[PDB]
Symmetry: D2
Amino acid sequence: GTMSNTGFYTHESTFWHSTGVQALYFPIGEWVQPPSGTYGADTPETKRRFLNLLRMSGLTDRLVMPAGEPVTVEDCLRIHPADYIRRFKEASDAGGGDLGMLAPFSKGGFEIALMSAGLARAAIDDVLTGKVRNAYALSRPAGHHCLPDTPMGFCLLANIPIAIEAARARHGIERVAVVDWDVHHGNGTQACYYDRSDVLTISVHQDRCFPPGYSGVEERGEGAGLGHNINIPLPAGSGQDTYVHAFETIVLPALDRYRPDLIVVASGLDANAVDPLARMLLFSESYRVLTGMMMDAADRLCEGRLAVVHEGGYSEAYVPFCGQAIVETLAGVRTGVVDPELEMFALWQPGDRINRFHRELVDEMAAVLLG
Amino acid sequence: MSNTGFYTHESTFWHSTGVQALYFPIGEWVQPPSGTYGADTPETKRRFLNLLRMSGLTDRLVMPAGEPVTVEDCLRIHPADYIRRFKEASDAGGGDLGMLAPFSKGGFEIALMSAGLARAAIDDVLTGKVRNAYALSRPAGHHCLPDTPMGFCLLANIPIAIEAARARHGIERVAVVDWDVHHGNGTQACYYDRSDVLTISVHQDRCFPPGYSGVEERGEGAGLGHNINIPLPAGSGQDTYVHAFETIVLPALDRYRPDLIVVASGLDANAVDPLARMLLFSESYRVLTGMMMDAADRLCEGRLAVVHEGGYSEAYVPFCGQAIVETLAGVRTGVVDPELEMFALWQPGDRINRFHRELVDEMAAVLL
Amino acid sequence: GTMSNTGFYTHESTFWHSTGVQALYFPIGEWVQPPSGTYGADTPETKRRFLNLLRMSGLTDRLVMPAGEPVTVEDCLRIHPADYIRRFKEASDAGGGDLGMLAPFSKGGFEIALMSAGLARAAIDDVLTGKVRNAYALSRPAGHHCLPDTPMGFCLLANIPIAIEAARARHGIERVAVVDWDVHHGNGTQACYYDRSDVLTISVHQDRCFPPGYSGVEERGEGAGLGHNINIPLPAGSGQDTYVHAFETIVLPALDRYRPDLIVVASGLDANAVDPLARMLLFSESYRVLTGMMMDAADRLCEGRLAVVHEGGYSEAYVPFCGQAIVETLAGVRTGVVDPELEMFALWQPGDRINRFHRELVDEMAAVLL
Amino acid sequence: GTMSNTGFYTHESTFWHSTGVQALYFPIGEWVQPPSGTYGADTPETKRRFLNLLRMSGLTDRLVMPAGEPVTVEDCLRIHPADYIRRFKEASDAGGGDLGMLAPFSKGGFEIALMSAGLARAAIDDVLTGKVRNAYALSRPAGHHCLPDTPMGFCLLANIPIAIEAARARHGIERVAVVDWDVHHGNGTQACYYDRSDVLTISVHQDRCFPPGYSGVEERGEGAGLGHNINIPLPAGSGQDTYVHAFETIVLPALDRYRPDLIVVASGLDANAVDPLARMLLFSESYRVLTGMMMDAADRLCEGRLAVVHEGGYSEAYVPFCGQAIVETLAGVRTGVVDPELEMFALWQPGDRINRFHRELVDEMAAVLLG
Ligand SMILES: OC[C@H]1O[C@@H](O)[C@H](O)[C@@H](O)[C@@H]1O
Ligand SMILES: OC[C@H]1O[C@@H](O)[C@H](O)[C@@H](O)[C@@H]1O
Ligand SMILES: OC[C@H]1O[C@@H](O)[C@H](O)[C@@H](O)[C@@H]1O
Ligand SMILES: [K+]
Ligand SMILES: [K+]
Ligand SMILES: [K+]
Ligand SMILES: [K+]
Ligand SMILES: [Zn+2]
Ligand SMILES: [Zn+2]
Ligand SMILES: [Zn+2]
Ligand SMILES: [Zn+2]
């Protein structure tokens, strides 16, 4: 019982990153009144409360929890140009700033970003060397929107690509699949590997949400990357049925065709049923099913090698239950935690008429993407 | 001076639901919140009023001093036992006498004031002191059953206000159009067997009450045909809402011929609300308010009273509320909604909208 | 009866000024963790809750509440150099900043600072023209630490000096007294008039608090201003007895000798018993006493002309009861408001031994200053 | 580098205790408006931020940090009557309550109180068995105002007395000294041992603060406890000089005469210079001095056996720097932490004239209490 083979990678400094004073994500000034209680959208508590519940549940006693270690600037330069890293560190040493679109940070945010990327790097490395069978990295700030030279949407470094390239330099790995179930499009991961065949990048996201107006079915890669990028925009208001169907008919077959040597999941929990930053209806049970599917795929394709890296998630109240369910599934253990909304959110799921239409939309995309 | 009344009182912001994480009670697995506590926080309503003041619009609004309803007003809807137990709990430490309707010490008096804002707004529209009105009621009312508070609602604000107007003025027909994203089960129950109020609810399918749709609940006895439930799919945007108003709500009002239109205006269908999955934004509420004003112009001499219900985004509710009041008053301000472009880009695609329109068209045929 | 002759000057935009993300007033960074919940020290709620209680009490029905109007850049230039105003406006048009010592502000803070100063200007003007007998201006951001060229300690413009100089240009008023009972030293007001006899500046403050380490008894002005500045540093831990003694034996006699044509109170409420930014023991009853004393002085010396301008106060929970008590005293009415801490904060007051010693310290200052 | 002999005892559940909605400590109601941001006075963050800074500082890598274990009902009954324990458990199983004066708690507060007391019990036990040389227990809820029959002032169980009596039953310890430097009077500790000679209870506190109006110099015990209780009320506005003089002239000589076999410090951090709940002027350097004096006393009198148990402290911004200073002193190490208020809070200290008068008051008390 005792110790599982699942690693959980976290460091206190990830909770010290601050985006500044916003009302939700709206900058103050003009017509947006400063907030009185919670400021910001990516608040530390939207990630800390997940860790706190994990500790209260007792699960941490059964997890491998290594000390966090930051990436180096050299690790960053495998993805980002030296000019971006210089200006980022320069602003961080002053009073912070925002070098992209909706990517604010405070004094010292550079070092925290290095630690966050280091949690992902260590999780992927420890899975590859067999120190653990699978892993969850509680990275904050997130990574999947960060382009090589432009931070975006709360993401300051390209966490997953940095971790993959660091692993390639130290281990060599023939093919990697990144499955992004954060509710927003993983435009950063897509851009980092768009012209390459050695990473299959898959994103399931709310149609048109972030980047705003973007769907992306027709963006399949270019050059050697043609056919190695898969975008699955789902309608707002999709629930577990739609997500499970997209995984069954698109994600899983795409992974079987590609035969990766490692599966990385970009795990945003912002598709949850009460998140302010999207319109989806997933709940804790949904994340159990999706995690189980990814574990099954990793078991069949790459000896169970599955690394899960946190991205978004904006409900302080409900994100902890979804994260708890993921880690429980990775570790193969249940706890005494009771999700208080388990039945309510099941009753909120769309009816059969809506689910049938959403499946038809998914089937149409599966024909376009897999044939 | 505009001819639009805005009814608000400071005490409505002093009602508190207690410590919850969102709406989850704290306990073994729900950690107490660190920043904002609760879901119906005072700021989800005060920030609307604050923006109205910053915009200058309050200088052109009629803003009477709030006056609470009396126990006699409450007893037209609620049994004396409920009102007694409510007052007794409020005089102690508060409590929760229903399902998800917590309140603190003194919450009874605040609920009387909240209902009084709705009573005054409706009365002032009926007597013509103002052409239309917005009542910033908190706590909300549209989930409150005659003997059971529910879903943040402690008294049946709109029904108390209608029955108070009837007791002085005698009104033959009133229509209540509820665009709060949750089903107005309280309004529905107060008038379910009556023809003198047409109750219409547009709500997210299955949301609150959880799993409830309600198309088939069309009234009973003398009220048969006088209740209309319009469940819309989660993820519906402006196109779907406007179509449901064009094809169901407005035709239903035309047939019924109300002497007064009351809108139960929750702002929780907004695109970033935590408590629903809809995609309305400030421009959507301008369109819907314009449609209700045009209906009131055609049917009842512009008599339109708008009573606040839900809305849970502290950041974004103010811009939606501002847009409604600007539309009621017929004046624009310098306020620019910073999310106008983004929330337009978020709207559903044509394929989704076409399917949602088919679903609305099917209900329109059934609902006559 | 019906309406009073007391004005209350407030504008919604004053609550929209933000100092940014700080833990209390500490900047976030390597060792100061970002706060969860309340960020900053000068939070909007430390002033808005005062107004909210005033509304709940019903007192606003009987107060004159004119619409707020800002001061102009021209009004500011009577005190501040154009270079400061230009750099302040420049930073405010971008993303905010901090041009001094512990004076952060956000985008648009310049226009809000103009409105805050405008509340003080209008309050003083309306008292002078007789529109109201007395007034309270809920200014935020505060003003009494702002030097002519350097903002400091949450103060971005010199509210009271700008208001006084505007009243001079408009009405030619000759002698004004400023009595500053904010718990911190009014170094800005002192600096603005240090060489001038047409304003008597008096500050009662916690010894060494803000500016840190400053006491100031011997700084009594210069030139024509010699004898027209009075600093009364009181020990940390002083309560109502000590404050009342300093007012009876120093403040009131100084006003009698100066013969002002207007009394302005710089009213910070941060000497209250639970404030985080000072160590004093005043409570709502204390502010009734001090306000009555200032009203008595104004009644004797300048026909009741008394304008009260808000400065500091950092207890969201308790500042409202102190502000309410001041405004009730100014209007000569009582309300149904019950201060829940009256019994406890009276029990917290220092014992006789300490009060005796504090009185001796006050007596020594009085012998020097008078 | 390597491990210190200092224990730090904390459990996640102590941060889940909630006092409910109060503005500061004022109950909400007709004239106290509900708070917007921070609710309550004893907020979880007033203790968690101390732990968070300890982790950031790297000091935790060199501290012994055992898993928290709660006390049992048997342990509580050594101090509290069965009727109180029964009623406390009953209210906790429902929806919480307040069984005393200013001691609210929420559902499940009973189990959390048992854990909080357990942190103190284990700290004292491990100091006594030699598992660590000294220890800090981050107890929350606090204990030192709790009377045997009546909770008070945020304290639900008598943490320190429960811990001492548990140590007596298991180890037979003969004499213990409790030195309470929380800014409020330790009326709970005083009551628990008032007629006993086997605990010397010393409290340094702001005169008249809490319980309100209480000074207490003349309350020196009864029966076998005569001369074994020492109250040192200091004036509001006292700073480091006054506190240090009180320790040099009263606390340290009292410990030398009593010859304890263990020293327990009831460590509230609410004498700090920005605390809302008192009027004192201590800062992080002051707590280094006071902790060093207690360590020197323990070194001379009881083989270094010193257990420090958290009580109050209500500045979220500043309490962490004071707690960090104490633990660094116990462990005998420095870190990279920079207290940002060192220069300002030194400038705030009282002038010579006040310090001389406060010293005279202290001298008069030493003449009554020790001679
Ligand atoms: O359909 C059942 C119906 O029963 C009636 O008694 C309630 O008042 C209605 O609101 C409800 O919908
Ligand atoms: O007066 C304003 C000043 O008050 C002092 O007590 C605080 O330490 C400073 O941070 C603040 O700026
Ligand atoms: O404070 C502890 C003691 O205080 C004394 O005044 C009481 O008489 C004692 O019974 C009590 O235990
Ligand atoms: K995605
Ligand atoms: K509805
Ligand atoms: K002063
Ligand atoms: K003490
Ligand atoms: Zn996301
Ligand atoms: Zn609603
Ligand atoms: Zn001050
Ligand atoms: Zn204390």
